[PDB]
Design a binder for this molecule. Structure first.
Ligand code: HEM
Ligand code: HEM
Ligand code: HEM
Ligand code: HEM
Lengths: 141, 146, 141, 146
């Protein structure tokens, strides 16, 4: 579970992201597509070329959902219900991919928040992302 | 592969006793039942609403046999699974858009089907050799992913 | 989340195991050591040879814990707290290993319960071993 | 290890700028902090009770450098990781009893560490190349496990 300390770390780190969340969401996706090409099998309908608007468009929706989870850190199961149903019943994204995107989001944050990305915050962000993945995968079967 | 002649012989010897028809249908069927998210690729086969609808589905059974068949040929080319599945790899990637992780799910389901069928005969050592083959196969099928 | 049918399925399947739980436990361990040699790194103090008394014993302990989990499938978290603590704070087994033992347990069940190991039961057992795994790795960090 | 000429150039060029002293200790420390169960291998290192106790531990710092030095050598032999890492693989298995999964956890932490240090210079394509390398090294360190 997320400790009070964990919650503080996340709010502060996400806090700093601010208005760049969407740009960071886009970048995380891009890093994921490049490092783990199997993930692209889920976006066959997308232009995955560099600077694709589709990717920019999608990165923002992903960032918004994370921004929403931070906002409702104490009720994540409910705040993300909808996204969980969608991923489980419509998209049917294999669960391993959540870990790949999480990893890419950490790298993205690390690359942009040098001062904030401390060992303790890095641990809190990992646990957080793991919690979000867990929720989004809870209604799979 | 990194199969010992002994492991090679174990795999090969058991395979000889395999009813491809029954095993292929069962392996594909259990895949769709156990990891329902894999049904996303077989929408056109029909009603997969239930275990029973899935196991009885002829399209599932028929495709399972096509799948175990390819598997069989790979067992005939264990020293070059890569070259044997190159065409099938690009198809699964470029045409089918199938997450390569599904190759690993299927491999494990297969092991469970061989255990179910062979019972006592599917010993820890035989299982160990088959774990290596399924991993090999799964790697070969994902090799041309880009 | 285990459905009532899953719960039924498990109780039914496990009921059939009966006096053989311990043997199945020792066999599942044996299959894991053999199939996934990295798992052996956790038992350097054991005699891992076929038919080892240590392996036989340990087989019984795991099987017994599973039995207790089935009995309290409704309250696993509490039925398994101590075990979650041991694994999390004492043993500190990497979480990936749980999936390997689970798989070997299914393999073993399949080979021993041909009539019972139906597609619906296989799926329930799979979900069950996964819930058990979740509980046991829940206090890791 | 499908390192294209360009991936290899990319890996190497960046590695040119790394202070192995530094990065080694950050990566090892971060491991012990993010995945606390990994502390199991180092109870002889003293206090690991808090992030500061871990990150500033002279023992973690010195061990990390030893590790990055070993890693550094693998980068000079991208051609032969298995041979390069064989005696270390055997050591970690047989004498240290280190679960091989630990090598992939470290690889990921190292990637976060390179990102942390290089900022914008650790581009998506550079990450992809490093991803291939740490998997390569993890596999070479696990090669002799039995
Ligand atoms: C923490 C992780 C994730 C979050 C927060 C997230 C969130 C979202 C959101 C907000 C949407 C848009 C839904 C809408 O139309 O309103 C979406 C769609 C989608 N997601 Fe995720 N997702 C996550 C993980 C993943 C992963 C790991 C994959 C696959 C590699 C994935 C594949 C997809 C796909 C294919 C769509 C539909 C896109 C389209 O057709 O426009 N998601 N997700
Ligand atoms: C050992 C693993 C596998 C092997 C050897 C294999 C082999 C094959 C073969 C031989 C075909 C024939 C298609 C053609 O020639 O046009 C095929 C098609 C297909 N495969 Fe696989 N496959 C494997 C795993 C999977 C998995 C796990 C999935 C998804 C869960 C999958 C999805 C498909 C689909 C959707 C088709 C198209 C069938 C159709 O045309 O309706 N494959 N596969
Ligand atoms: C289904 C999941 C599991 C269950 C129910 C389980 C159950 C148990 C039980 C009942 C014990 C003995 C506690 C005692 O001595 O009172 C134990 C100990 C232990 N477990 Fe697990 N375990 C599970 C998974 C794992 C896995 C996956 C590993 C590592 C690969 C592992 C490693 C160990 C070790 C090393 C010990 C101590 C053995 C000794 O020193 O005697 N466990 N476990
Ligand atoms: C890139 C991956 C790694 C490399 C290149 C590496 C390299 C090394 C080297 C060069 C040594 C010293 C050998 C000796 O004492 O003769 C060592 C020792 C050791 N390694 Fe690793 N290692 C790696 C990953 C790990 C991981 C992930 C762990 C556990 C989390 C680990 C556990 C140990 C331990 C416990 C020792 C001995 C510590 C002591 O002196 O008390 N290694 N490793």
């Amino acid at each position: 579970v997320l400790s009070p300390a964990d919650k503080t770390n996340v709010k502060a780190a996400w806090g700093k992201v601010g208005a760049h969340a969407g740009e960071y969401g886009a970048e995380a996706l891009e890093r994921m597509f490049l490092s783990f090409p199997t993930t692209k099998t889920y976006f066959p309908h997308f232009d995955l070329s560099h600077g694709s608007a589709q990717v920019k468009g999608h990165g923002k929706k992903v960032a918004d959902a994370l921004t929403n989870a931070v906002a409702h850190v104490d009720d994540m199961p409910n705040a993300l219900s909808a996204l969980s149903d969608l991923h489980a019943h419509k998209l049917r994204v294999d669960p391993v991919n959540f870990k790949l995107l999480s990893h890419c989001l950490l790298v993205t944050l690390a690359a942009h928040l040098p001062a904030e990305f401390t060992p303790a915050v890095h641990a809190s962000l990992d646990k957080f992302l793991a919690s979000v993945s867990t929720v989004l995968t809870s209604k799979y079967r | 592969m990194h199969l010992t002649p002994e492991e090679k012989s174990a795999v090969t010897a058991l395979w000889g006793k395999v009813n491809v028809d029954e095993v292929g249908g069962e392996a594909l069927g259990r895949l769709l039942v156990v990891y329902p998210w894999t049904q996303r690729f077989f929408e056109s086969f029909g009603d997969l609403s239930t275990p029973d609808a899935v196991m009885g589905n002829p399209k599932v059974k028929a495709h399972g046999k096509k799948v175990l068949g390819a598997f069989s040929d790979g067992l005939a080319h264990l020293d070059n699974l890569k070259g044997t599945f190159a065409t099938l790899s690009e198809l699964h990637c470029d045409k089918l858009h199938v997450d390569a992780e599904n190759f690993r799910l299927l491999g494990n389901v297969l092991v469970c089907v061989l255990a179910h069928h062979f019972g006592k005969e599917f010993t820890p050592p035989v299982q160990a050799a088959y774990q290596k083959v399924v991993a090999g196969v799964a790697n070969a099928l994902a090799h041309k992913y880009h």
